Amino acid sequence: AKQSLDVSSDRRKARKAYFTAPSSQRRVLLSAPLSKELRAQYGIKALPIRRDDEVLVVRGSKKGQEGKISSVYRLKFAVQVDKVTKEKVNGASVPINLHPSKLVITKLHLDKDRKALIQRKGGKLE
């Protein structure tokens, strides 16, 4: 149960906030849990997903397939992995729209800001 008077339990307000969230808010909304190996290694559970990290699909029909994130389509609340596609006879390949809550990060793309984010969340890298 909520206790703050500044938070709303209204379903209409929550849904409007979700579907009108801007790009920077959608970055936080599109978060993916780490793998067990990475969770033990870094000491954190989940991170916002970005373009150049490798993932494992743990839900849906594409479960078990591995690949690198190809795009973060924030406009449609989805990510695209390079190896996960739907193919046609005429040679067409359509990327599958996956949700990061149904993915697991197996290798992080590490830069300066990523290391700072892990450390400020409480990481123990190296």
Partner: peptide
């Protein structure tokens, strides 16, 4: 190979 073409031959 990694690229996607949604149209194919079309």
């Amino acid at each position: 190979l990694k690229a996607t073409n949604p149209n194919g031959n079309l």
